Every structure is written in C-alpha cells, then in structure tokens.
Amino acid sequence: DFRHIVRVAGVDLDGNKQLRWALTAIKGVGINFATMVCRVAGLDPFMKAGYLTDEQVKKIEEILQDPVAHGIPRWAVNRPKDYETGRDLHLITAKLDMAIREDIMRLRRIRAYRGIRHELGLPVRGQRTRSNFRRGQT
Amino acid sequence: KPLSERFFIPHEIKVMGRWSTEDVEVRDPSLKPYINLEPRLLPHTHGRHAKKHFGKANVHIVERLINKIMRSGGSHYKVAGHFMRREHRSLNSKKVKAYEVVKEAFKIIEKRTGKNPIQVLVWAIENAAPREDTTSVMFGGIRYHVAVDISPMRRLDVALRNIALGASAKCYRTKMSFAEALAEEIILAANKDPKSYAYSKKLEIERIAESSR
Amino acid sequence: RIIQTTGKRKTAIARAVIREGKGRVRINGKPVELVEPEIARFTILEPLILAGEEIWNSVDIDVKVQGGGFMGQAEAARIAIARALVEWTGDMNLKEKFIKYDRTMLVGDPRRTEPHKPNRSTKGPRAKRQKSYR
Amino acid sequence: ATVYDVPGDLLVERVAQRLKEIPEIKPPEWAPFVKTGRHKERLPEQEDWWYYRVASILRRVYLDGPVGIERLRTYYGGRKNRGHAPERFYKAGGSIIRKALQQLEAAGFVEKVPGKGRVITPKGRSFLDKIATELKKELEEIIPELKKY
Amino acid sequence: CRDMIVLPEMVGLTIYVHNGKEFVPVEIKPEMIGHYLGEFAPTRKRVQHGAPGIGATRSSM
Amino acid sequence: EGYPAEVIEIIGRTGTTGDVTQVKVRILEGRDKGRVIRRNVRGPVRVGDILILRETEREAREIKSRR
Amino acid sequence: MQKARIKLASTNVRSLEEVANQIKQIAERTGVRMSGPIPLPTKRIRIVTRKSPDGEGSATFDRWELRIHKRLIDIEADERAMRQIMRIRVPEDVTIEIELI
RNA sequence: AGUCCCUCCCGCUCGGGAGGGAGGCACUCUGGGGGGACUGCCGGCGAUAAGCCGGAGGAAGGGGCGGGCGACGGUAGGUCAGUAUGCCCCGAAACCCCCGGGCUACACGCGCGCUACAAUGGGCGGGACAAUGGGUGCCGACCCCGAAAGGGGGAGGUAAUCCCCUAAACCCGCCCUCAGUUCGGAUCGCGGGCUGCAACUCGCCCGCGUGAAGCUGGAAUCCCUAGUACCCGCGCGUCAUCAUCGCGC
Ligand SMILES: [Mg+2]
Ligand SMILES: [Mg+2]
Ligand SMILES: [Mg+2]
Ligand SMILES: [Mg+2]
C-alpha cells in the first residue's frame, strides 16, 4: 500500500515522516498548529505519512479551510479579526503572500510613519542603528 | 538499565562493583610503584591531595582516568587540525555523566574480548608514554633546542591526556557516540596500531626528538 | 540503649539515629536501596560495607539531614554512619580499617567556601574582567 | 508499606493506568488544543497526557499535608528559553490544576480545608497504599532487600 | 495634542500637527481611525551622509 | 630500548625556562652496570625513582656549579 | 501571671548586657522566677558605595555596616517586680517594651 | 530525639507508617563568655646565632585561611557637572516656570558581553535536594472566574512567628540519527494585556504564523594556584514599570 509521496493542499510531502511533522512544509502551518488539526481529524499524530488514503486528507484540507467551524478555537488562528471582515481565518501558501503585501500597501497608501521603515528599509520595531544592522559595504 | 541493575547492591569491596585489581600486571618497572592498586571502591576523593608536594601520586588509576575527560577538549592548542571549543554544552564539572560514560565504556571493552578491562588499560598506558624529549638550554647567551629524558610521572600524565584527546576527537559531530569512541582508543593503544592516535603522539615525539639529538 | 550522631560538610547537617534491631536503615523517608544518584548510593554504603555484613544484620538506623545538595548530603550521612558504628561496637580494629580506606570519615572536614570580590562579583574572588589595550 | 518506601515514577506510572475508570475524571474540552504553560515549547506528545497529570497531582499532596494552588503553580514550572536572552525561572499555568482539583474532589479522594489549604481523606490513603503494596509485591522478586523492610 | 485618536468625526478633514519647529498639514482619509495623530508627522529629518573624516579608523589618531 | 637506571642524587635545574634538572644517577645493568653519570631530566623527580633511558652513553653537559 | 514579655534592642552590645543582668538581678532580688535572657538573631544591614566622586580611575568599593542586637526575657507578673521594672531608668541607646500575652 | 495519649492507613497486623496535643531542651540552632599551636618536642644543616629543611602527634601547621586599614612626596593625571570656593562675565537677561521635539538619528572603524554553529544533544513527561537578603506607598497565605497573559475576593503579618519560596545543571522512559535538520530563532505580519498626568518617535508580556547570518573560526592577545578555574540558578541597587549590568549568594 505504501506510497512515498502524498500531495495535500498544494505542496506534497514524503511518506517516511511522522504525520504531525511533514505537514510543516505548507507555508503558514507549523508544529503547534499541526497536532491540533491532527487530533481534531482523529488520526494518529505519529504515523508515517506513507499511510494515508484519500478521503482522510480530504477532510484534512476541509478543516484547513475552516478551523473554527469545528472546534479549533478563536485564539490560535492565523489572523483573528480580519481587518477587512473580522471573521476567523487561517491561510496557506497560495494566499498569505497576498495578505502580507496588501497590508504593506495599506501603510504605503497613507504615508504613515511605519511604512517609512518598509520603504527606506530599516527596522520598524524600535531598535537602534548606531551599532549593528550594518548590511552593506565599507 | 534493567531494574536488576538499576538498583544495585554490593557486598564485595571492589571497584565499581564489577571488577577488581588483584592479578593485573604492569611489566614496565619504571611505572610500577606509581599505579595505586588498593581496593578503594568509590573512585572519588574531592581533591584532598593536590595541595602538598608529590601528593597526587597515590590515586587509584580509574579515578585519574575519569577526571581527565571532563573537557571540551583543548581550547588554546590545536588538535587534528580544528579547534574544539565547545562551551556551555560541555562536561566540565558534571562528574555524573563522566562516571556513567566510563562505566559503559568499560563494559564495551569487556564484551568485544572478554578480559579484565583495567588490565587492558594497563596495556594501553604502557605504550603511549615516551622516554625522551626536548627543551631549550641557555649556553653562552645563545639558546637552542636539545633533548632530554622524560620522568615517569610526566610520562603517565601525557599518556593519559593524549588518549583522552584522541578518543575525544573521533566523535566531533559524528554518528558514533562518545562511549565506544572511547573503547576504540584503548583497544588500538593496546594493539600499537599506527592508525591509532595515542601511539601516534609517542611515535612523532620520539622521532623529532631523535631528529635533533 | 540509643546513641545519636552528627557531622557537617559544606552546609549539610546530618543527624543520625541508631539502636538495636533487624538490619534496616532509612533516610528522610528513603530506604537506602532507592537512591538514583548511584554515585551517591556508593558514598554512604562504604562504612556499611567495611563493617561486614554481620554487624549489618543487627541494627536499626534512620537519619535526618538537611541543607546542601544531593552530593553534599551523602558525605554528611557517611560521617554519620561511621561516627555511629564507632560507638555501637566501639572496639579498636573497626576504627583501624576505617583509617586505611579513608581519613576524613572521622577527623572532620575543615573545607569551607569563600567570599567573592568586587571586580566581577558574580564569579569568584579571583576571576577578573579581561584587560583592555587599544 | 507507605509511599515513603518506593521509587516515584514507578508508583506514578502504575496508578496512572487503573485511574482510567472513575467516571468523575476525564479530559476537559480545551484538552487537545493547549500547551501546559509558559514554560512549554511544544505540545503534549503522548496521549494519556491527562491521566498522568491527575495522578502525579494525587501523589503530591498525600505526602504533603495542607496545600493550595499558588504553590502548585510553583512546582510545575520550568526554565523557559526566552529568545536571544539568558534563562530565567517561571511559574506555570493554573486552569489545569483548577479543573483537576475540581474533578479530583468530586471523586472524593480529597477535601477542602478552609483558609488553610487541602488535605487527603481516608479513601485516598487506602487507595494509594493499596497500589503501593501491590507494586512492592512484585518488585521484591528481583531485588532481595525489599524483604527486610 | 499629538496623541489624538481620530474618529468618525474627522474622516476626510484637514488639521495640523507640530513636529519640532513648525505646523504641518495632515488631511484625513479612511483607514486612519485607530492610529494616533502624531504618527503621521515625522520628527527627525532623514540623513544622507557625507564621507568619513578624521579618526574614524585607527590609522588616524 | 628499556634500559633502567636509578636516581641517586638531584643536583640542580637548568634550561632557559627552568625545566631540566641536573641529576647524577647510576646505571644498574648492561655493558656498564655500575658507572655513574650525569644527565638532565624533564618533569618532577624524587630521590629514589627508576628512570629509563635509551643510550647509556650521552654524558650530559655540565652546569655552572649548580648555583 | 499572663507572661508579660519585655524586650531589648541596641547597638552598643556592651551597653545592653548591663541592663539585661540588671533585670536578672532584681527579678532575682525579689522572690519570683524569670526566664534567662533569650538571644535572638543579630540583625545586619549592608550598604556599599563607590569610593570615587567622578568616573575616572578604577572603581573601588566600600562596605558600610551596622548590626542590630536583639534579646528577650520573660518574667512573671509580680507587682513587686512590676515596680522594680518601673524604676529602671535605661541607658539612652537601648529600647525596652513590655507586653503581656 | 527518647517517653504518653488521641486520630488515621497497610501484607490484617504479630509488626510498619503518619498526622495533631502535653512534656523536654537531651540533638541541630541562635550568642555572649571561655579553652584551643607555641617551630613547642625530637630528626638534619646552618656558628653553636637568627634561620630554613623533616618527621611525628593533632580540628588545625611554620603569616592557621579570607578581608580592613595605604608612610614621606609626587603625579599641573581627575572632579568648580554632588556641596564649598577667588576673579571675570549675564544681569530683564547666560535667572524660574510651564505644552512640544532631542540625547533612542545611520554606508562604516573598534571595545565588553548574550544567544548559537546540534550526540559531552534537541523535544515530551515523570522523579530529586539549595543559600544571602527584603517587606505597611509594601509584602502578600488561601478561593472562584481566563487557554496564557491576568483580572476578582482578599484571610495573616511592623518580622527565628505570617509572606517573597516546592531553583538549575541533576536522574529515568519515549520520539529524532550526520542533516543547514526537530540545530540555530534573527527578521517581519496580525491579536489580547499591564503601569502610567501621558506609551506613534519611544515602555513590557503573551497566543498563531514566516523562518535570516551561522558547519569550531587568519596573523594576535586575555583570565586563573584550591573548595580556587569551569558550568547552572537565586536575592539586592536601580525602580510607578523594563536587568543581557554592577554587587552578594
Ligand atoms: Mg590637568
Ligand atoms: Mg547617547
Ligand atoms: Mg528549534
Ligand atoms: Mg514605542
């Protein structure tokens, strides 16, 4: 039965890895999210990924497109109170990129302060610069 | 591990409760009166000796071995090429892990042959302590290299240090663990093999000592 | 009859208790046979292993100790058991063989720690900063 | 044959199994989605991460008399690794221990002494030292000094 | 009062601020509510360096 | 190869860094077995140890009267 | 009865034992028991400060110190002893207080 | 601790254990007074001297171990920006207040340190023992509301009494195995709190995401003689709040 590659929500992963791990490869999901979706699907968190049929990971993605609708709570989701519609959302590879750039373009639209350090490209969270972050040349 | 041992009970005054020193033999007489062999079950003395002159002569040998691996290695004189400054993930003062690892190492020695491990240490530290080396003497305002003979105790201590260093050099970021990394040293030292390390340093010291006699 | 014994090593007091009995010995609730720092479980058996298994067939002993660390309680307890066994039977040879194997099992420990100094003040009297040219 | 006489994790592991029946005790509904405190860095790994905790809370107070909450959040913490910075001690989370002692009282092993802390009932002492004795009743097979005491 | 937090009142409007030597025009748009007032009035002019001089390297002391 | 000789007197310490030691010892066996010679040794030594040497004819070079 | 318990606390260690044994004597002088003086944890306060006014030179440090002595004495309540403990006229650098349990 | 009652468990109990209360200060403790080592006895030089060698005896050995005290004079070194202080200055101002911005800017040179470059490990969870100091503007035992941050009631304390306080390296079971990875956790996105007359420039914590340089380091130089050096935590100064610092443990 063994396959060595399982493709779920876009990017695949090997079938030789513990199932809680290898899903790490989807940009926007780490460990301490992973065990959650695992335990709310109802499948072992240790099994070697090479043991997955189809309809299971179908459910997996299904949860992956609405964690809150099934028990995953509202204080570990990838953006709570979505500034365009406060709903609870957890995003993935395809669409996080879009979000980061739109939320940059926001402050790029109003000429606030915070944008200036994305534009002029130096730290934003109030370090100093007179000793470190020397990233160019002599 | 297994609880048959995890809890242990001795009624025999030995070392480590597994082996004892009654019949071993050091051949080389220059080292004879300088290797303690009294029972001394617990190899731990709390430095009540390195205060008066020539005090450290009488320690049971396994203790002098166990302390002399509490090392990141060498940190100001290169070894095998690289430096091995490992700091804060060391074993500097943590004698517990030292006792434990040396226990496992002795049991591994006992397996792959089946003999008194400490006698095997006896063969080992007999063949890595050289018997000459060099200095510089002042003769007339001009000073230069010469050669002289090494006193026993220094033979002893250089021997042990080189063994420890060697074994502590085959494990650097290596699948091989530290324990058998020890055994593969005492073994080779007892087999005077060139591929070993402790034998290397005795050979390469005496060579360049006789190169400039 | 009963006798009571003490000893101190790096701020770890040890009160021993002895009396006639069967051959069991505890510490702070612990039976001796259950001590995970085996390199400690050997730090207190030695006056119980030189005395012979036979004197170790007639005694009830429990110790109360406190202060210091898990390698510091062991030697205070050892001092306890020894200065006890030396009064229970209190003959002379059994002080004899307790001299050859080690000394400070009897003569008491003078080794005491040290202040710190006002140059790093967080390491020790003799580890200063690192000097500065240029 | 009281608990002072046996190694810890043995008795702990032991009681942790047969504690599966008491219908008082079960994992609450924020069980799978929570790390236990400000000194965890990963989640609970093994499955019976509930029952072990309930048990090892049982063992504590028995040989410890009167105690409460603010201190049990002070045994169950660990050195956290705060980023670039050195390491520092911390206390842990509480809501766990709270629901825990709720369901454990409701079982009936313990009872609340007002203003002074908590204690263990008879039921608890007998239930404990029973399994204590059972455990010593086979370990003694293979180490012959558990006989004498 | 640089620490105003704009509201349904002012969206669209035009007030000033103070930035260290002057008053400054800030005109209002949506998306500004939630921010402060002063956030939009910079305080330290940027720096466009000249060239190193005397001493800046240990050859020149 | 293995020749031992026995230390019978320590005479002084030479070497630009205070390391060698003037020590008049006796050979114990061999084609000589009884001739008492002059050598400098490295390490610490006590009157009464058993030293190995390897040439039995080197006759180390004299000191400035030990003082 | 009621175990009135008096107190003492001073800086000059010498000038305290004087009145301690004074009360010891009187409580002995009349016929009534008295518990020996109970020594208590000596008290210390440590204050260091940098010995240099400016910031140049190496930094050299002082250690000022002041130890506070406490004692304790329990006596019965015999009014014939109450009256003697009222004519005490203590030294100035000692403080006494009386409170019965 | 040894005696005595009461009360509670266990192989049902012959023995074991553990909680209170009444008695004792025997034992640790707290601290004032006391005794305690003098090259003293011998062994060897060195004059036979002053001395150093030695070995006994002993809790300690030949300044018993660690700290306080710093002579004459300098050093035109330092500080009038802690207080004093001669002269010259400003004197409706170079005086005294308030609301705002600044010391926190940024191609780069260097000093002192923290986290690492994984097996002398990382992660889960069980199992062990510490010490100096501090408390009424503050410390806070205990109980219920939160996932965690915290909030809510607040008993008890001005001190060997109640509180800050059940450290960590440590041990044992499971997962990971030569990898820029389960090493390393920068850097940025959201969202929930704290103190504060006031948190954008410019305070602090926590939940989820992303996952940067980094594979032990050239010529040079630095720190250490015994409970010392190394490694792991804590308490104070600072202080309405934040410790990668000094200072003790
Ligand atoms: Mg000047
Ligand atoms: Mg500045
Ligand atoms: Mg990591
Ligand atoms: Mg800010």
PDB file of C-alpha atoms (C1' of nucleotides) in Angstrom, chain D residues 1-2 4 8-9 12 30 34-36 38 40-46 53 56 59-60 64 68-75 77-79 81-89 91-96 98 102 115 118 125-126 129-130 133 136-137 140 149, chain H residues 8-11 15-19 114-116 122-129 140-150 153-155 162-169 172-175 182-186 205-208 232-234 242-245:
ATOM      1  CA  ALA D   1       4.314  -0.166  53.410  1.00  0.00           C
ATOM      2  CA  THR D   2       3.596   3.514  52.891  1.00  0.00           C
ATOM      3  CA  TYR D   4       7.837   6.625  51.529  1.00  0.00           C
ATOM      4  CA  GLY D   8       8.387   7.654  42.455  1.00  0.00           C
ATOM      5  CA  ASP D   9       7.772   7.229  38.747  1.00  0.00           C
ATOM      6  CA  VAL D  12       3.094   7.129  39.319  1.00  0.00           C
ATOM      7  CA  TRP D  30      -9.835  22.586  25.904  1.00  0.00           C
ATOM      8  CA  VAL D  34      -3.402  23.737  24.723  1.00  0.00           C
ATOM      9  CA  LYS D  35       0.182  23.601  25.848  1.00  0.00           C
ATOM     10  CA  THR D  36       0.578  23.324  29.592  1.00  0.00           C
ATOM     11  CA  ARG D  38       4.502  29.463  29.855  1.00  0.00           C
ATOM     12  CA  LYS D  40       6.231  24.612  27.398  1.00  0.00           C
ATOM     13  CA  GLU D  41       7.631  24.976  23.893  1.00  0.00           C
ATOM     14  CA  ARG D  42       5.844  22.049  22.287  1.00  0.00           C
ATOM     15  CA  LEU D  43       2.514  20.397  22.878  1.00  0.00           C
ATOM     16  CA  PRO D  44       1.722  17.339  24.964  1.00  0.00           C
ATOM     17  CA  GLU D  45       3.066  14.454  22.950  1.00  0.00           C
ATOM     18  CA  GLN D  46       1.826  11.167  24.370  1.00  0.00           C
ATOM     19  CA  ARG D  53      -1.179  14.777  35.392  1.00  0.00           C
ATOM     20  CA  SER D  56       1.017  12.929  39.819  1.00  0.00           C
ATOM     21  CA  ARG D  59       0.686  11.614  44.837  1.00  0.00           C
ATOM     22  CA  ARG D  60       1.950  15.055  45.827  1.00  0.00           C
ATOM     23  CA  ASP D  64       2.447  16.767  51.750  1.00  0.00           C
ATOM     24  CA  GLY D  68      -3.335  25.032  47.759  1.00  0.00           C
ATOM     25  CA  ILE D  69      -2.999  26.412  44.236  1.00  0.00           C
ATOM     26  CA  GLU D  70      -0.488  29.335  44.211  1.00  0.00           C
ATOM     27  CA  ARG D  71       2.186  26.897  45.184  1.00  0.00           C
ATOM     28  CA  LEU D  72       1.331  24.045  42.898  1.00  0.00           C
ATOM     29  CA  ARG D  73       1.919  26.504  40.114  1.00  0.00           C
ATOM     30  CA  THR D  74       5.380  26.703  41.649  1.00  0.00           C
ATOM     31  CA  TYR D  75       6.461  23.090  41.437  1.00  0.00           C
ATOM     32  CA  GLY D  77       7.278  25.242  36.123  1.00  0.00           C
ATOM     33  CA  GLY D  78      10.490  25.006  34.187  1.00  0.00           C
ATOM     34  CA  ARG D  79      13.263  27.197  32.886  1.00  0.00           C
ATOM     35  CA  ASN D  81      14.220  29.783  26.846  1.00  0.00           C
ATOM     36  CA  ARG D  82      13.326  33.425  26.245  1.00  0.00           C
ATOM     37  CA  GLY D  83      14.861  34.150  22.877  1.00  0.00           C
ATOM     38  CA  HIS D  84      18.244  35.832  22.469  1.00  0.00           C
ATOM     39  CA  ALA D  85      18.223  36.380  26.223  1.00  0.00           C
ATOM     40  CA  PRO D  86      19.501  34.386  29.204  1.00  0.00           C
ATOM     41  CA  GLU D  87      17.307  31.891  31.007  1.00  0.00           C
ATOM     42  CA  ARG D  88      15.008  32.618  33.950  1.00  0.00           C
ATOM     43  CA  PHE D  89      12.632  30.646  36.148  1.00  0.00           C
ATOM     44  CA  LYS D  91       5.589  29.721  37.395  1.00  0.00           C
ATOM     45  CA  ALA D  92       3.156  27.825  35.153  1.00  0.00           C
ATOM     46  CA  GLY D  93      -0.484  27.942  34.133  1.00  0.00           C
ATOM     47  CA  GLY D  94      -3.280  27.199  36.541  1.00  0.00           C
ATOM     48  CA  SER D  95      -6.644  26.493  34.945  1.00  0.00           C
ATOM     49  CA  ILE D  96      -5.394  22.956  34.519  1.00  0.00           C
ATOM     50  CA  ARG D  98      -8.066  24.123  38.896  1.00  0.00           C
ATOM     51  CA  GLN D 102     -12.329  20.056  40.960  1.00  0.00           C
ATOM     52  CA  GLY D 115      -8.255  29.162  54.539  1.00  0.00           C
ATOM     53  CA  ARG D 118      -6.160  20.966  51.016  1.00  0.00           C
ATOM     54  CA  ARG D 125      -4.720   6.981  51.752  1.00  0.00           C
ATOM     55  CA  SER D 126      -6.096   3.463  51.377  1.00  0.00           C
ATOM     56  CA  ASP D 129      -1.064   2.473  49.701  1.00  0.00           C
ATOM     57  CA  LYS D 130      -3.044  -0.395  48.245  1.00  0.00           C
ATOM     58  CA  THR D 133       1.706  -2.595  48.332  1.00  0.00           C
ATOM     59  CA  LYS D 136       6.149  -3.753  46.097  1.00  0.00           C
ATOM     60  CA  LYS D 137       4.524  -7.204  45.859  1.00  0.00           C
ATOM     61  CA  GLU D 140      10.648  -7.710  45.500  1.00  0.00           C
ATOM     62  CA  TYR D 149      11.544  -3.547  55.156  1.00  0.00           C
TER      63      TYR D 149
ATOM     64  C1'   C H   8      -5.804   7.904  60.520  1.00  0.00           C
ATOM     65  C1'   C H   9      -3.811   3.637  56.758  1.00  0.00           C
ATOM     66  C1'   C H  10      -1.039  -1.149  55.336  1.00  0.00           C
ATOM     67  C1'   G H  11       0.691  -7.740  53.609  1.00  0.00           C
ATOM     68  C1'   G H  15       4.967  -5.675  63.195  1.00  0.00           C
ATOM     69  C1'   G H  16       5.379  -0.984  59.742  1.00  0.00           C
ATOM     70  C1'   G H  17       3.999   4.050  58.868  1.00  0.00           C
ATOM     71  C1'   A H  18       1.869   9.077  59.588  1.00  0.00           C
ATOM     72  C1'   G H  19      -0.794  13.325  61.423  1.00  0.00           C
ATOM     73  C1'   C H 114      24.222  37.054  25.325  1.00  0.00           C
ATOM     74  C1'   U H 115      22.355  33.526  22.338  1.00  0.00           C
ATOM     75  C1'   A H 116      24.195  29.508  19.000  1.00  0.00           C
ATOM     76  C1'   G H 122      17.005  18.874  20.866  1.00  0.00           C
ATOM     77  C1'   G H 123      11.689  17.765  22.414  1.00  0.00           C
ATOM     78  C1'   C H 124       7.687  15.236  25.514  1.00  0.00           C
ATOM     79  C1'   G H 125       6.720  13.756  30.904  1.00  0.00           C
ATOM     80  C1'   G H 126       7.614  11.889  35.048  1.00  0.00           C
ATOM     81  C1'   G H 127      11.410  11.757  39.781  1.00  0.00           C
ATOM     82  C1'   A H 128      15.229  14.546  43.405  1.00  0.00           C
ATOM     83  C1'   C H 129      17.796  18.401  47.166  1.00  0.00           C
ATOM     84  C1'   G H 140       1.276  39.207  50.258  1.00  0.00           C
ATOM     85  C1'   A H 141      -1.107  32.962  52.522  1.00  0.00           C
ATOM     86  C1'   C H 142      -5.834  30.954  50.739  1.00  0.00           C
ATOM     87  C1'   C H 143     -10.938  30.739  46.567  1.00  0.00           C
ATOM     88  C1'   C H 144     -13.530  31.166  42.210  1.00  0.00           C
ATOM     89  C1'   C H 145     -13.819  33.382  37.239  1.00  0.00           C
ATOM     90  C1'   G H 146      -9.217  33.208  31.711  1.00  0.00           C
ATOM     91  C1'   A H 147      -6.003  28.747  27.257  1.00  0.00           C
ATOM     92  C1'   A H 148      -1.905  32.235  28.739  1.00  0.00           C
ATOM     93  C1'   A H 149      -1.035  36.979  29.925  1.00  0.00           C
ATOM     94  C1'   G H 150      -4.010  38.419  34.065  1.00  0.00           C
ATOM     95  C1'   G H 153     -12.396  38.497  46.850  1.00  0.00           C
ATOM     96  C1'   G H 154      -8.865  39.183  49.883  1.00  0.00           C
ATOM     97  C1'   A H 155      -7.650  35.955  55.189  1.00  0.00           C
ATOM     98  C1'   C H 162       2.833  35.213  58.568  1.00  0.00           C
ATOM     99  C1'   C H 163       4.641  36.372  53.440  1.00  0.00           C
ATOM    100  C1'   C H 164       8.551  36.863  48.965  1.00  0.00           C
ATOM    101  C1'   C H 165       9.921  30.324  48.254  1.00  0.00           C
ATOM    102  C1'   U H 166       8.435  23.198  46.483  1.00  0.00           C
ATOM    103  C1'   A H 167      15.627  26.746  41.677  1.00  0.00           C
ATOM    104  C1'   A H 168      19.042  24.684  37.898  1.00  0.00           C
ATOM    105  C1'   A H 169      22.754  21.718  35.999  1.00  0.00           C
ATOM    106  C1'   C H 172      14.685   7.682  34.268  1.00  0.00           C
ATOM    107  C1'   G H 173      11.082   6.135  29.969  1.00  0.00           C
ATOM    108  C1'   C H 174       9.606   7.561  24.588  1.00  0.00           C
ATOM    109  C1'   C H 175      10.331  10.292  19.552  1.00  0.00           C
ATOM    110  C1'   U H 182      13.157  18.533  15.286  1.00  0.00           C
ATOM    111  C1'   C H 183      20.280  22.619  15.016  1.00  0.00           C
ATOM    112  C1'   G H 184      20.185  27.789  15.223  1.00  0.00           C
ATOM    113  C1'   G H 185      15.447  31.502  16.239  1.00  0.00           C
ATOM    114  C1'   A H 186      17.007  36.811  13.715  1.00  0.00           C
ATOM    115  C1'   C H 205       4.224  40.472  28.306  1.00  0.00           C
ATOM    116  C1'   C H 206       1.598  36.522  25.644  1.00  0.00           C
ATOM    117  C1'   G H 207      -1.201  33.315  21.566  1.00  0.00           C
ATOM    118  C1'   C H 208      -0.551  31.844  15.796  1.00  0.00           C
ATOM    119  C1'   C H 232      23.778  26.155  36.280  1.00  0.00           C
ATOM    120  C1'   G H 233      20.112  29.494  39.220  1.00  0.00           C
ATOM    121  C1'   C H 234      18.621  32.990  43.190  1.00  0.00           C
ATOM    122  C1'   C H 242      11.528  47.082  31.866  1.00  0.00           C
ATOM    123  C1'   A H 243      18.424  43.684  34.042  1.00  0.00           C
ATOM    124  C1'   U H 244      21.866  40.651  28.508  1.00  0.00           C
ATOM    125  C1'   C H 245      24.788  45.491  34.244  1.00  0.00           C
TER     126        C H 245
END
